[PDB]
Amino acid sequence: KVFGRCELAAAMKRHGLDNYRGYSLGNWVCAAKFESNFNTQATNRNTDGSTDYGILQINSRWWCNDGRTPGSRNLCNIPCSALLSSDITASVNCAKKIVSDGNGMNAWVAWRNRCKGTDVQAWIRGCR
Ligand SMILES: CC(=O)N[C@H]1[C@H](O[C@H]2[C@H](O)[C@@H](O)CN[C@@H]2CO)O[C@H](CO)[C@@H](O[C@@H]2O[C@H](CO)[C@@H](O[C@@H]3O[C@H](CO)[C@@H](O)[C@H](O)[C@H]3NC(C)=O)[C@H](O)[C@H]2NC(C)=O)[C@@H]1O
């Protein structure tokens, strides 16, 4: 599923991400834009042998099990493929754990490089 921008904003809001750990909704929408282009099916492999999964590009070294990542920790206790669903519930539940683990949204590299410190509220412009 490729979410619309306001469509994703509404879903993230309904799941309680707006201001979760102090990160406004625009931060989360911006992160998803640059991590996955709003595509729930997005996957990308990394040099360490891990892969990123889904709308928020959750990493298989730390958070989910994909059966092929050395040193995996599976801290969200979930198969990585469940993070590719059209329903964002599992990704949101796991993201809440990730952002609570110490480093806040710095866990998301694209957020750090492209959203952090920018006018993120623009990502929710026009949304109801
Ligand atoms: C969303 C996500 O899964 N982010 C992880 C990120 O994934 C990137 C990928 O690296 C890129 O190539 C492409 N995109 C994705 C998404 O942007 O990958 C990072 C590197 O593996 C992960 O960062 C590590 O996260 C762990 C766990 O949170 C960090 O360990 C924690 O560190 C804090 C502070 O030092 C400490 O208090 C915690 O106790 C500790 N947790 C654990 C379980 O040990 C670790 O520092 C990060 N490493 C780096 C280099 O940032 C990121 O989660």
Sign of CA dihedral 115, 121, 122, 128: positive
Among protein residues, the one with the nearest Cα to ligand 1's atom 47 is 107
Q: Residue type at 55?
A: I
Burial (CB count within 10 angstroms: exposed 0-12, middle 13-18, buried 19+), residue 39: middle
Which domain, by its residues, includes 10? 1-128
- The total of structural domains in the chain comes to 1
CATH number of the domain where residue 106 is located: 1.10.530.10
Active-site residue (options: 7, 35, 48, 66): 35
Non-local (6+) Cβ contacts of 111 within 8 A are 27, 30, 31, 34, 35, 105
Structure determination method: X-ray
Residues contacting ligand 1 via CB (< 6 Å)? 35, 46, 52, 57-59, 61-63, 98, 101-103, 107-110
Q: Residue 53 pairs with which residues in a beta bridge?
A: 43, 58
Within a 13 Å sphere around the CA of 57, how many CA atoms are in the beta-carbon half? 20
